Structure 1
Amino acid sequence: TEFKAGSAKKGATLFKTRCLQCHTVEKGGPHKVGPNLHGIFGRHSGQAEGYSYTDAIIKKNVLWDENNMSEFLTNPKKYIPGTKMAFGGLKKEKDRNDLITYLKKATE
């Protein structure tokens, strides 16, 4: 870890305002622009069923952990050139820590 637990409540509202437009986090939630994130931690990328991922993200084969995730959020196209994820990134560590604390709980 190089990822410090933040505030899950602060994390939830980041999600709502920066990620809800393309993703759901609930168990049984649907895929939208972006795939559903239920159970993404400890799972490699491009593996949710019934979702058309890029070749890019598939091949990348990232194993998603709090630390991988933090780098990805920093800058998504920079981390996985080729990705269709349209997000510029979360530059502040504090914001990323919060959001990951939230994702950690919500996708379990």
Structure 2
Amino acid sequence: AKESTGFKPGSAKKGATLFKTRCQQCHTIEEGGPNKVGPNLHGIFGRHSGQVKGYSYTDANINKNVKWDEDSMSEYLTNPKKYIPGTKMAFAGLKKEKDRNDLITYMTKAAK
């Protein structure tokens, strides 16, 4: 629910730091970075869920076929399991809206 989301741009600075303290443990975002616990996120926005080559996803994520946009990412980050029952991503999610906007700001930039 994109509209619902109505995602607003935030602090890319801020996003940068939430990435490190929260997604870096398991993911890279750099162009040409490798998979790790989670898959490399470079190019995420221009792609559906479950397609980075050489990464083994759950049927759940593959089947989910999400077209990752910022409204999409926003739901998913509040509760990944909730957005994708069966996913193996282990993280409670980002509950504050502000948090998610900052992050997605960075992501949107870093991942391009």
Select which of 4, 7, 11 maps to 1:7.
11
TM-score by length of 1: 0.98
2:83 is matched with 79
TM-score by length of 2: 0.95
Q: Counterpart amino acid of 2:101?
A: N
For structure 1, the residue ranges without an aligned partner over 5 or more in a row are none
What does the per-residue CA deviation read over 1:55-93, in whole Å, with 9 as the maximum and x for residues that have no partner? Answer: 000000010000000000000101000000001000000
1:20 is matched with 24
What does the per-residue CA deviation read over 1:21-80, in whole Å, with 9 as the maximum and x for residues that have no partner? Answer: 000000010100000000010311000000000000000001000000000000010100
Output the aligned Cα RMSD. Answer: 0.7
Distance in 1 (CA, whole Å) between partners of 2:60 and 2:108 is 24
For structure 2, the residue ranges without an aligned partner over 5 or more in a row are none
4+ aligned runs moved over 4 Å, structure 1: none
Percent of paired sites with the same residue: 81
1:92 is matched with 96
1:44 is matched with 48
